């Protein structure tokens, strides 16, 4: 037979860029934001999609803010700063959190309400009045 | 509601890395049974108890790289918190530290400090205190902070720096020379003026941070406020900003 093409869905008839299961033609096989192909260079998989290497970390490039390794899969997104989700945690415990515990903002780190409860009056009155 | 045999001694079979002893009215480490036999963990949460001291046998847990005290009443760190090579977390807010042990700075990973909430200034902090250039991440806010030392330029790879609610009646200008820094909370001091080299950092994209409220700025900073963060590094960059600020120091 003839494969078929993964971006303008017609039939392939030059050369046949295998990638990422997918046939592809010459010039179709490109990059996510910028349009241009590969034409031979090398690909960047994530979750479908394919980028060069000069893209490939302006998205999928946050860094851990608990372990300094840069994110490998969900990255979960905060207080202006960057978490895995297994690195994620409350800053005064220790025990894991999610976007779905109720936490509070204590100097951009997330603290979790129980912990908040145990800070000292004088310090919670005082931060009610500031951001 | 494990008791404190069970969380000992089920970390050692199980092979546990992560203990968590956290809000469980211990008063001392050694009373903790065979704590300190656990020489593989890396992580030891001790929050929310009511630890006095920190005892030398914190040494032999070799492969901490979590270690948090917060919400303690230590009134005093030993020598041998500084030989823990693995360690890059160390939390010892809200404790009652109004000193650091000799030689602190020996940690040779450390790569987030939180002092937030002691009795910490300037005298408290030990001579090799900034050999930790490892660190990133450094919170010492409330505290009684009336200087900071000009070596805050050798944490080069520091990217959080928190001094909220100090004592604080200027900055050291060598916070120009930490290039990589993203948050700098300045909050609650007697801050009367930048200095202008601090105009080098550029902290008004988005996923940076300057807070800088309730401090007695001089008119002419305060109005820069007003109009927003990049107003305030445009203005200290400025040149009628620098007559101002030589003219305002031998004042
Ligand atoms: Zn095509
Ligand atoms: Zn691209
Ligand atoms: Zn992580
Ligand atoms: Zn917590």
Redesign the interface.
């Known amino acids: 037979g003839v494969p078929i093409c993964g971006a303008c869905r017609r039939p392939i008839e030059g050369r046949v860029v295998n990638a990422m299961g997918k046939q592809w033609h010459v010039e179709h096989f490109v990059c996510a934001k910028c349009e241009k192909p590969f034409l031979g260079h090398r690909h960047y998989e994530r979750k479908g999609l394919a980028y060069c290497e000069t893209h490939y970390n302006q998205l999928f490039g946050d860094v851990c803010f608990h372990c300094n390794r840069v994110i490998e899969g969900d990255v979960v997104s905060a207080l202006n700063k960057a978490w895995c989700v297994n690195c994620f945690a409350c800053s005064t415990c220790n025990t894991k959190l999610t976007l779905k515990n109720k936490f509070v903002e204590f100097d951009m780190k997330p603290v979790c309400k129980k912990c908040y409860e145990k800070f000292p009056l004088e310090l919670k009155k005082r931060l009610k009045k500031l951001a | 509601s494990k008791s404190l045999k069970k969380l000992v001694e089920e970390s050692r079979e199980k092979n546990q890395p ?1 203990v ?1 002893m ?2 469980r009215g211990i008063s001392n480490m050694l009373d903790v049974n065979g704590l300190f036999t656990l020489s593989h963990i890396t ?1 030891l ?1 001790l ?2 108890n009511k630890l006095t001291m920190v005892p030398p046998n914190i040494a032999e847990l070799k492969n901490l790289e ?1 270690l ?1 005290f ?2 303690n009443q230590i009134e005093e760190l030993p020598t041998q918190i500084s030989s823990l090579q693995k360690l890059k ?1 160390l ?1 010892l ?2 404790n009652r530290l109004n000193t650091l042990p000799r030689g602190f700075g020996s940690l040779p990973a450390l ?1 987030v400090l ?1 002092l ?2 002691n009795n910490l200034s300037e005298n408290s902090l030990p001579g090799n205190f900034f050999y930790l250039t490892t660190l ?2 450094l ?1 010492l ?2 505290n009684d902070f009336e200087i900071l030392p000009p070596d805050i330029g050798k944490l080069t790879k520091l990217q ?1 720096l ?1 001094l ?2 100090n004592d604080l009646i200027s900055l050291p200008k060598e916070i120009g020379e930490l290039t990589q820094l ?2 700098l ?1 300045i ?1 609650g001091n007697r801050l009367t003026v930048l200095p202008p080299e601090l105009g080098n950092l550029d902290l008004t994209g ?4 300057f ?1 800088a ?1 309730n401090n007695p700025w001089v008119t002419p900073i305060a109005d820069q406020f007003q109009l927003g963060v990049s107003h305030v590094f445009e203005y200290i960059r400025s040149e009628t900003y620098k007559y101002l600020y030589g003219r305002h120091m031998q004042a």
Do not use: C, L
């Open positions: 992560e968590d956290s809000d992580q949460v929050s929310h979590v948090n917060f919400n977390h939390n807010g809200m790569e939180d937030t909430y990133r991440a919170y806010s409330d959080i928190s909220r609610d993203k948050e909370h909050q988005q996923k940076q941070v807070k409220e």
